[PDB]
């Protein structure tokens, strides 16, 4: 079983996006109006699943091969890699990183997406990876395309990859989005801008990583993830 022997740095909820961010229209009716109730951390909050023994398929991290229906997907071949650390700089090893994204034309393989850009018969758009003993993960994929959506009358998501990271506890678990260096859709996006602090937004922007590219093959982007800092309990019930 799991034990309560750690504490996690309290979240800065003005660094994160707030609940009510009206320019992102769906958040209006889907945001609480009451204050969140602060509770102290107990074993319920400071523990969480470890996926070391989840069975991973050989292509789970590789979106160029995990939806093979006779060929390679069309689009910019890229590696997406990085390190998952906590706020103290400590690697987060053997942690689950999941990702999902649209195809090269901004079309999602989801029954609810009727955008007129076509599906790619060799692209599904889901991956997962356990971090290594040093906190590293990597994916191989196609760079996604921007996506129009029914928010404002001419709103377009920047190219983006959705990420889900478990970390060591249910307190550290995070869902976020990766954006791409220099994309001029980024400052126009009301989802991006649900984050008030521009320095926070910068933290979501993956950087072109030529050092990690395969020549004549695929480019590479770096996306590092910082989860809440973990420390030992001290001077508790004494």
């Amino acid at each position: 079983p799991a034990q309560d022997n750690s504490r996690f740095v309290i979240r800065d909820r003005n660094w994160h996006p707030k609940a009510l961010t009206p320019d992102y229209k769906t958040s209006i009716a889907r945001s609480p109006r009451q204050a969140l109730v602060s509770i102290p951390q107990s074993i319920s909050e400071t523990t969480g699943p470890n996926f070391s023994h989840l069975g991973f398929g050989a292509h789970d991290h590789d979106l160029l091969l995990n939806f093979n229906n006779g060929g390679l997907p069309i689009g910019e071949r890229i590696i997406v890699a990085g390190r998952v650390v906590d706020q103290y700089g400590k690697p987060v090893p053997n942690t689950l990183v999941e990702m999902w994204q649209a195809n090269a034309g901004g079309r999602y393989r989801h029954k609810n997406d009727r955008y007129l850009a076509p599906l790619d018969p060799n692209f599904g758009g889901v991956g997962r990876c356990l971090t290594d003993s040093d906190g590293y993960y990597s994916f191989r994929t196609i760079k996604p395309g921007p996506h129009p959506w029914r928010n404002g009358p001419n709103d377009w998501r920047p190219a983006h990859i959705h990420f889900g990271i478990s970390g060591p506890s249910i307190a550290t678990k995070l869902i976020t989005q990766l954006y791409f260096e220099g994309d001029p859709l980024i400052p126009m996006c009301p989802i991006v801008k649900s984050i008030a602090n521009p320095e926070a937004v910068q933290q979501l922007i993956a950087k072109l990583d030529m050092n990690n590219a395969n020549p004549m093959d695929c480019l590479a982007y770096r996306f590092d993830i910082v989860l809440r800092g973990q420390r030992k309990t001290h001077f508790e019930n004494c």
Binding site: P17, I39, S44, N50, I170, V226
Partner: protein
Amino acid sequence: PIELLPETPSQTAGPYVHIGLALEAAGNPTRDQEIWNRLAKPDAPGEHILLLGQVYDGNGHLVRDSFLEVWQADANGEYQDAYNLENAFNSFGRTATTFDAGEWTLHTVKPGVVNNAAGVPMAPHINISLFARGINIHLHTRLYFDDEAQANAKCPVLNLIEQPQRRETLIAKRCEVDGKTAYRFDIRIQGEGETVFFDF
């Protein structure tokens, strides 16, 4: 003062969350191993229960694209972190609301009692994280049980909710579904009967 690395900021899970996290519900093929809504095989120890609920927005309307992650103790009040689909019991699971009825289900056992950090017993509960389009950072809540009224009244977490009326929002209602103990736990994100959400 001391400043650490800043946490990576949250973003909405988005409407297509099912693609990466609920593969069936998206309409896509599943991989051989999936994190889903059965925390207990028939052979697991404890009272086997069905959980179900719906999720409402601020206008009283169903959230048909929501995604829930849960974390609960086994029947002995111990958290089982070694996730494995070979286990009779996992402490963690995932479920989603159907785009049709808007209802999620979970197949599990009733959790045993866990003490808080000061050694005071918490009523039996399931920890819930709610994700969805329009939800910028996930909402944390707890599902407690209406057949634990006396434990619930002494829970030191429930008692941090200042108004007794708001505590009611966390109490699942027991029923029977096809001969199995079941509880309904509806979530109201906003407005009349708004569900208590936690920060920790």
